Amino acid sequence: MENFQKVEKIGEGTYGVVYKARNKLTGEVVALKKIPSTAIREISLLKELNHPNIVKLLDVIHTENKLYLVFEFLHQDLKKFMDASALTGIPLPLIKSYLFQLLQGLAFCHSHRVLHRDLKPQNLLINTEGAIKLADFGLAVTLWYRAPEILLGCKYYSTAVDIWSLGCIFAEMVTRRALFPGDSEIDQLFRIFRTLGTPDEVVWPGVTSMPDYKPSFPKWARQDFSKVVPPLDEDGRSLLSQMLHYDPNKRISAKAALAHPFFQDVTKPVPHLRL
Ligand SMILES: C[C@H](CO)Nc1nc(Nc2ccc(S(N)(=O)=O)cc2)ncc1Br
Numbered sequence: 001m002e003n004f005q006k007v008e009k010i011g012e013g014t015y016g017v018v019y020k021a022r023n024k025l026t027g028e029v030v031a032l033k034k035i036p037s038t039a040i041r042e043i044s045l046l047k048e049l050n051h052p053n054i055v056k057l058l059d060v061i062h063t064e065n066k067l068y069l070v071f072e073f074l075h076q077d078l079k080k081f082m083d084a085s086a087l088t089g090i091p092l093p094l095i096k097s098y099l100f101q102l103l104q105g106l107a108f109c110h111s112h113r114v115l116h117r118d119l120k121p122q123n124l125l126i127n128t129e130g131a132i133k134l135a136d137f138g139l140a141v142t143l144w145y146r147a148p149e150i151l152l153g154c155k156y157y158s159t160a161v162d163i164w165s166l167g168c169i170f171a172e173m174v175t176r177r178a179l180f181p182g183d184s185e186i187d188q189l190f191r192i193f194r195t196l197g198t199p200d201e202v203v204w205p206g207v208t209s210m211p212d213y214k215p216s217f218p219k220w221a222r223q224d225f226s227k228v229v230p231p232l233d234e235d236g237r238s239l240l241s242q243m244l245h246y247d248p249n250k251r252i253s254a255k256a257a258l259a260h261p262f263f264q265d266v267t268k269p270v271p272h273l274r275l
Contacts, residue, residue, distance in 0.1 A: 001063055004032055004070075011122065015139060020073060030058065031074075031135075035067040043069065046138040049112060053105030055125060055135040074125035074133060075275050078169075081126060084274060086176050094269045095173045096236075096262065098124075098132045102166055105134045107254035110159040114138040117157075119165035120145050121172070130270040143188040144168065144181050148199070149248055151189045153211030160248035163257070167243030174232050190218070196244065197222025204246040235262040 004021040010031065011018035021032040040062060047057050059070035082090065102124065117140035126132050145165035149157050171179040182188025198219045199207045207213060225237055232240065239260045242252035
């Protein structure tokens with residue numbers, strides 16, 4: 001890790017801090033993430049997990065209590081791009097491209113039993129050629145993308161959690177505002193309830209016996225879905241509702257979502273990026 005000149009800090013969670021960096025000898029520009037035997041073996045496995053819509057993990061560096069992951073560098077994240085596009089909106093065909101590629105990335109990881117668990121716009125990275133890629137997964141303060149079953153204390157949650165988060169991202173790209181911007185776990189859960197309606201045994205068998213479920217939860221009626229994402233067309237809306245099903249078992253898989261009618265006319269536009 002003397003092999004790398006830090007250029008700038010580009011990110012941080014509590015996992016670690018991410019820098020754009022330059023290899024002193026090869027000149028390559030990379031993203032360097034500065035972060036237990038179990039974790040070493042696990043991240044070794046993730047290194048083999050190559051797909052066009054997953055940020056490539058090039059190298060793992062374990063040096064004295066400290067662990068660095070060396071990633072390929074992409075040039076902008078989706079949040080910054082959504083903000084830059086905020087007056088105009090991202091054109092539907094590019095929204096659809098990005099949602100489609102993200103679903104290919106999920107299906108691939110999911111087929112390997114690898115989950116993201118913490119998807120958000122800052123983990124979705126774009127380039128000038130119209131690709132979008134997922135960063136930070138298998139690695140497992142923003143609750144906004146969190147699936148209802150995590151919030152209800154489920155211990156053994158599934159690949160469905162990433163479909164939920166990706167559904168909330170889709171809605172946000174379309175409306176140019178976050179769908180569920182909670183500022184606490186309960187606020188997050190109650191904002192979900194107030195839009196989609198308070199879940200019960202009819203729509204989510206077993207929900208009322210989940211660890212943090214309370215009979216005292218207010219009982220809100222579900223809102224009209226056309227009020228949630230105007231002006232998504234009805235195909236996008238149907239796909240969105242399948243991604244935001246309460247019951248993780250009813251919630252559409254990445255693989256099934258790829259086949260949804262919404263993607264019948266999918267293409268790959270290039271975005272206009274200001275770097
Ligand atoms: C920090 C980000 C998500 O953890 N990780 C990466 N980010 C990038 N690039 C990056 C991230 C953010 C931005 S920003 N915030 O200017 O759009 C620009 C480039 N590249 C590879 C990785 Br891994």
